[PDB]
Amino acid sequence: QINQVRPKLPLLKILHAAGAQGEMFTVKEVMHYLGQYIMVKQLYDQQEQHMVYCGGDLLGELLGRQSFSVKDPSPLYDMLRKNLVTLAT
Ligand SMILES: COc1ccc(C2=N[C@@H](c3cc(Br)ccc3F)[C@@H](c3ccc(Cl)cc3)N2C(=O)N2CCNC(=O)C2)c(OC(C)C)c1
């Protein structure tokens, strides 16, 4: 069931838009919803599926990189540690 977390408002809005409600979802849920959002808004390449291509989406603007890798999520963790209250997995 639901456990302790606190996000940032422009990141919580990605979480509502990915299918959620409230602001209370742990890093496991946040990353699941980020995967749904990237697939739902189509922020990736069909051959470079390990690579995200948000190009100017509110998610890419908020994270501060408009492209990043699933095997090198460095700007994604950097945004999360500055948005969320430091949830890690
Ligand atoms: C070889 O390339 C891969 C491999 C794996 C994925 C992958 N792995 C997850 C994941 C990764 C991490 Br770091 C931490 C927690 C996770 F939960 C998650 C995801 C969620 C949010 C983000 Cl920001 C990025 C990726 N993620 C998916 O959303 N998937 C994998 C299964 N099938 C799908 O269609 C969608 C993949 O994803 C890209 C398409 C986005 C591509």
UniProtKB/Swiss-Prot annotation:
Posttranslational mods: Phosphorylated.
Localization (cell): Nucleus
Known tissue expression: Expressed in all tissues tested with high levels in thymus.
Domain SWIB/MDM2: 3-86
Source taxon at top rank: Eukaryota
Domain remarks in the Swiss-Prot or TrEMBL record: Region I is sufficient for binding TP53 and inhibiting its G1 arrest and apoptosis functions. It also binds TP73. Region II contains most of a central acidic region and a putative C4-type zinc finger. The RING finger domain which coordinates two molecules of zinc mediates the heterooligomerization with MDM2.
Subunit annotation: Interacts with MDM2. Interacts with TP53, TP73 and USP2. Found in a trimeric complex with USP2, MDM2 and MDM4. Interacts (phosphorylated) with YWHAG; negatively regulates MDM4 activity toward TP53.
Illness association: Bone marrow failure syndrome 6: A form of bone marrow failure syndrome, a heterogeneous group of life-threatening disorders characterized by hematopoietic defects in association with a range of variable extra-hematopoietic manifestations. BMFS6 is an autosomal dominant form characterized by intermittent neutropenia, lymphopenia, or anemia associated with hypocellular bone marrow, and increased susceptibility to cancer.
Designated name of the protein: Protein Mdm4
Taxonomic lineage: Eukaryota, Metazoa, Chordata, Craniata, Vertebrata
Residues of the full protein shown: 23 to 111 of 490
